[PDB]
Every structure is written in structure tokens, then in C-alpha cells.
């Protein structure tokens, strides 16, 4: 057989790569971690270094406190018993306050308060991490595409957890912290809004989610097919088109009658992904605020 370039035949290693410096404050970079030969079959073997400034420590700490708050509730639901904890791990749920408390923070710990505390911690965790994604780009002099793309995921999450409940006048509209409980919430939500299959933004969201699987299968497959011409060296193919980029374009031109460029496929990539949660977030925000029933809406609006 031809070798397929899914795993590597031979790994090489050199001195720990400490990265480009540009404007980065090097006092906030760790040392390199260990090298993993296991990872090395598929990707890079090197772990670390990581940058960890003030915003990083804040984000991580807040994130852990989020995880502390859910897990202390879980253990309490477990009656402090580790057998039960493992047995019922997926059934435990930290639920938001009842409708009766509206948007107040006036609710007992065991019946709302803790949920708010957990959400407080997540909110600080996600947003500071978002800041991290912008600032690590800035320090290296790169574009802000990552921070912008991450903002689209934040959008859906903000809508589900914060914006939609505020507009609906109660925290009770938000999602519980629990594995099974949050799946139940998802199903309920659709039932109670007349079946989200009739929400056109839900449909578009699916178009893009599937679309992302299509595009990345296409793209990844394509780069691997042209890796014998150095195709994965995308930046240098952008700067100086090679037979890799040409064979890639032409595969698609000949198959489906049109094609990409080596930079431009990444614009199709970024937008395909990002629109999942953009459209998704609209679909939910509209639900119950403006449309109570997507079946019914459908009857009246094409």
C-alpha cells in the first residue's frame, strides 16, 4: 500500500521550541512540559510552555470555582457517599431559582443561590478567557480572527444562560448544570416552543453544523491528499502558490466546477463554523421572547 499520512512513520525531535517572542512578556511563559511520543504519532509531541498572566490566573481560578461549586452540590446530592457519587453522577443537577424569584439574587443557596454563584464564576471564566484569546493574538502581532470566532460561541452561551433569561424576566429560564438534566432541558425547550425543527434559524444552524463536518472532511482530506507536495504549509502556499495548491484547486474545479484558494478556503472554514452558533443564538433568543410556537409561526410566515 501507499502510505496515507494519517500517522507518521518516523518521529524526529530537537531542542524544546520556546516560541516566537515578538511583544510577549516572557516572564509569564512557563518552561516546556514533557514530550509525548504518543501524541507524536498524530501531531506535535511537545507539551508547553503555556503563557499565564493575570487574566489567565483569573480565568483558571474562576473556572475551577465554577467546577468546585457544581461538584460540592453533587457530593451533597450524593449524601457524601462516593459509591453513590459515581453511580448517580449523570443524574445530579444544580438547578436555577424557581420562577417565583424572578431575576433577583434573593434565593436560598440550596434552591437557586448556588446556581447563580456557579454562573457568576463561569461568566468571569469565559469572558476573561475571551480576553486572553485577543491579547495572545495582539502580543504576537496577529489578527483577531480567533477572538472574533470565539465570540460567536459565546453568543449562543450568553443567550441560553443570561440574555434570554433576562428578557424573559426570570433565571428559571436558564439551563441547569447537570449531564442528563441539561439534555432534558434541551428536549423540553423544543416541546414547549412547538418543535424547534420549525425554527428556521435552527434549521440553518444544522445546515452549518453538518456543513462544518462536510467542509473539514473536504479540507482535511484535500490537504492530506496534497501533502506529498507540501500542502500543509499553507501560509507559504498563500505567499507563493505551489503545485500543492494547484492540484487541490483543480481537484475541486473538475469535481464540482469551482474551487477555492489556499487562503480563501480558510474564509469558507471560519464562516461555516461561526454561523452555527450565530444563527443558533438568534433562534433561541427569538424563542419565547417573540415566537412562542415555531409550528404556529410557520403557518403564518411561509
Amino acid at each position: 500500500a501507499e502510505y496515507q499520512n494519517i500517522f507518521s512513520q518516523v518521529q524526529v525531535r530537537g531542542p524544546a521550541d520556546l516560541g516566537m517572542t515578538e511583544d510577549v512578556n516572557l516572564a509569564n511563559r512557563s518552561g516546556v512540559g514533557p514530550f509525548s511520543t504518543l501524541l507524536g504519532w498524530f501531531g506535535n509531541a511537545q507539551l508547553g510552555p503555556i503563557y499565564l498572566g493575570s487574566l489567565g490566573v483569573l480565568s483558571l481560578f474562576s473556572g475551577l470555582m465554577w467546577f468546585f461549586t457544581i461538584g460540592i452540590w453533587f457530593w451533597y446530592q450524593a449524601g457524601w457517599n462516593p459509591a453513590v457519587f459515581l453511580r448517580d453522577l449523570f443524574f445530579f443537577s444544580l438547578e436555577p431559582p424557581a420562577p417565583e424569584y424572578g431575576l433577583s439574587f434573593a434565593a436560598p443557596l440550596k434552591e437557586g443561590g448556588l446556581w447563580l454563584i456557579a454562573s457568576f464564576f463561569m461568566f468571569v471564566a469565559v469572558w476573561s478567557w475571551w480576553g486572553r484569546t485577543y491579547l495572545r493574538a495582539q502580543a504576537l502581532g496577529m489578527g483577531k480572527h480567533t477572538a472574533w470566532a470565539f465570540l460567536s460561541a459565546i453568543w449562543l452561551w450568553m443567550v441560553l444562560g443570561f440574555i434570554r433569561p433576562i428578557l424573559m424576566g426570570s433565571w428559571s429560564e436558564a439551563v441547569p448544570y447537570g449531564i442528563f438534566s441539561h439534555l432534558d432541558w434541551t428536549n423540553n425547550f423544543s416541546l414547549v416552543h412547538g418543535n424547534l425543527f420549525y425554527n428556521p434559524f435552527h434549521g440553518l444552524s444544522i445546515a452549518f453544523l453538518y456543513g462544518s463536518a462536510l467542509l473539514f472532511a473536504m479540507h482535511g482530506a484535500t490537504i492530506l491528499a496534497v501533502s506529498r507536495f507540501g500542502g500543509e504549509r499553507e501560509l507559504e502556499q498563500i505567499a507563493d502558490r505551489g503545485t500543492a495548491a494547484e492540484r487541490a484547486a483543480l481537484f475541486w474545479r473538475w469535481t464540482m466546477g469551482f474551487n477555492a484558494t489556499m487562503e480563501g478556503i480558510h474564509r469558507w472554514a471560519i464562516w461555516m463554523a461561526v454561523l452555527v452558533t450565530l444563527t443558533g443564538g438568534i433562534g433561541i433568543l427569538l424563542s419565547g421572547t417573540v415566537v412562542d410556537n415555531w409550528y404556529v409561526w410557520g403557518q403564518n410566515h411561509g
Binding site: 500500500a1 501507499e2 502510505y3 499520512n5 507518521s8 512513520q9 518516523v10 518521529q11 524526529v12 525531535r13 530537537g14 531542542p15 521550541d17 516566537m20 514530550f35 511520543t37 507524536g40 504519532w41 506535535n44 509531541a45 511537545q46 428556521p200 434559524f201 440553518l204 501533502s227 506529498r228 507536495f229 507540501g230 504549509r233 507559504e236 498563500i238 505567499a239 507563493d240 502558490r241 505551489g242 503545485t243 500543492a244 495548491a245 494547484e246 492540484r247 484547486a249 469551482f258 474551487n259 477555492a260 484558494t261 489556499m262 487562503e263 480563501g264 478556503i265 474564509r267 469558507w268 464562516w271 444563527t279 438568534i282 427569538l286 417573540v290 415566537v291 409561526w297 410566515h301
Partner: protein, 240 residues
């Protein structure tokens, strides 16, 4: 109704997005041509975008696209039909001529540099602290073509320094000279390296590199082109 507004707006947006996206992807290879290289009459309904310029590192200049397209090399092919849409037959040996699946692009005849401006790909012998870390070390294995004959021996791996990966095998031939083989086109076996794409007699014709310790992007394209071309053009001498 606000949802009707939102969704109507969304389609308009998505239509504009696709337009934008499609035009961004015409920054190379357009305007379209006839088979004699003159500009085709029907270019499509999408116009070419306003150009952008990439500033290249290390004093290497800029790239402005779209711009004047041009192969900057001869193309040893001739028509095989009196109308559009048929294949173009090689006028000599397609492997030597670099046409077909043996094609190469006239890239810069300089090496790709890393972030510090050092050559990206170096032979391991010249690459401080680099060594094989996992898998079977090819260095020293005899190299076998698809005719089941020995074309040479592996004398080094050429490694990507910044990405720490193997990119080529350097193979010494019966006359003492060497060639690069793409790592993606060789199977490292327990007691040999096997190269399906090329018969042993075709190894001498792999394009050579002008300096023995670096490769240029032009040189990479010729090498990688030539070796891939063998899949089609060595097929008579193949026995698989």
C-alpha cells in the same frame, strides 16, 4: 414580525457573504483562459476582487493578488483534438518535462525560512540537537523502487526545524550523488524503504538540488512533482 425581519435579513446577509467568499477565492488563477492561454470570453458573473497585498517576512517583498498570472515556464503539451475540452498530450517525456501529474510550479528559487529567518528544512546532520525519537530509523536502509530493484540507500532525513517533522529522505545513488524523496511517498519497512511511485531506473532523473544543505521552494516542487508523476508514468515498470 421581528422573526420574519431577522430571517429575511439573514438571507440577504448570506447571499452577500457567499458573494464575498467566492470573489476572495478568485485571487489566484483568474482571469480564466482559453487553452492557448489567451483570456476567455466568459469569465463568470463574479468580478475579480480589489487587490490585497501580503507583506512577506525577511525582506522577501510583497505578493499582490489578484495580479498578472503567468506560468513562467514552458509547457511541453499539444492539443489532441480540434475543439475545447480534450486532453493535451505530452510532446516529450512527461516526467522530464514536468507536465501532467509530474507538474511543478515556478515557485521562488529560495528556501522557506522560519520565524527567525533560518532555513525551515535542513538535513538532520546539520540540524543541532535533532535525532530520530520514535519509529524505525530509515538512515542506512536500502531504497527499493516498484520494479522491486534497489535504487540506492538512505543517507539522511531532512527535517522541518520549527515543526520537528521529517520531510524528505536523502538517498544516495550508485554514482554517489543523492536525491530527495518526499517522506509522504515512501514506506519505511523493517529492512528497506520502499518507493511505489518510481522504478529504480527513474531515480537518477529526480531533479537535484543546487546546494547540498538547503532546498528551495522551486526545487521542492520539481522533486515532489516528479515523484508523484511516477504513479501514472512508471506504471509499465510497476509490479504491485
Amino acid at each position: 414580525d421581528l422573526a420574519s425581519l431577522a430571517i429575511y435579513s439573514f438571507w440577504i446577509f448570506l447571499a452577500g457573504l457567499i458573494y464575498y467568499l467566492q470573489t476572495e477565492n478568485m485571487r489566484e488563477g483568474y482571469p480564466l483562459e482559453n487553452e492557448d492561454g489567451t483570456p476567455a470570453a466568459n469569465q463568470g458573473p463574479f468580478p475579480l476582487p480589489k487587490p490585497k497585498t501580503f507583506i512577506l517576512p525577511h525582506g522577501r517583498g510583497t505578493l499582490t493578488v489578484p495580479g498578472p498570472e503567468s506560468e513562467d515556464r514552458p509547457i511541453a503539451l499539444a492539443r489532441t483534438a480540434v475543439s475545447e475540452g480534450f486532453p493535451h498530450a505530452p510532446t516529450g517525456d512527461p516526467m522530464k518535462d514536468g507536465v501532467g501529474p509530474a507538474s511543478w510550479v515556478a515557485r521562488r528559487d529560495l528556501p522557506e525560512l522560519d520565524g527567525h529567518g533560518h532555513n525551515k528544512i535542513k538535513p538532520m546532520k546539520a540540524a543541532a540537537g535533532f535525532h530520530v525519537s520514535a519509529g524505525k530509523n530509515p538512515i542506512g536502509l536500502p531504497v527499493r523502487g516498484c520494479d522491486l530493484e534497489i535504487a540506492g540507500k538512505v543517507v539522511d532525513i531532512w527535517v522541518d526545524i520549527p515543526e520537528q517533522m521529517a520531510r524528505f529522505l536523502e538517498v544516495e545513488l550508485k554514482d554517489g550523488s543523492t536525491r530527495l524523496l518526499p517522506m509522504q511517498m515512501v514506506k519505511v519497512q523493517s529492512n528497506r524503504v520502499h518507493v511505489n511511485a518510481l522504478s529504480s531506473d527513474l531515480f537518477a532523473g529526480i531533479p537535484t538540488i543546487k546546494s547540498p544543505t538547503e532546498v528551495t521552494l522551486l526545487e521542492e516542487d520539481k522533486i515532489c512533482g516528479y515523484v508523484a508523476g511516477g504513479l501514472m508514468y512508471a506504471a509499465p515498470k510497476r509490479k504491485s
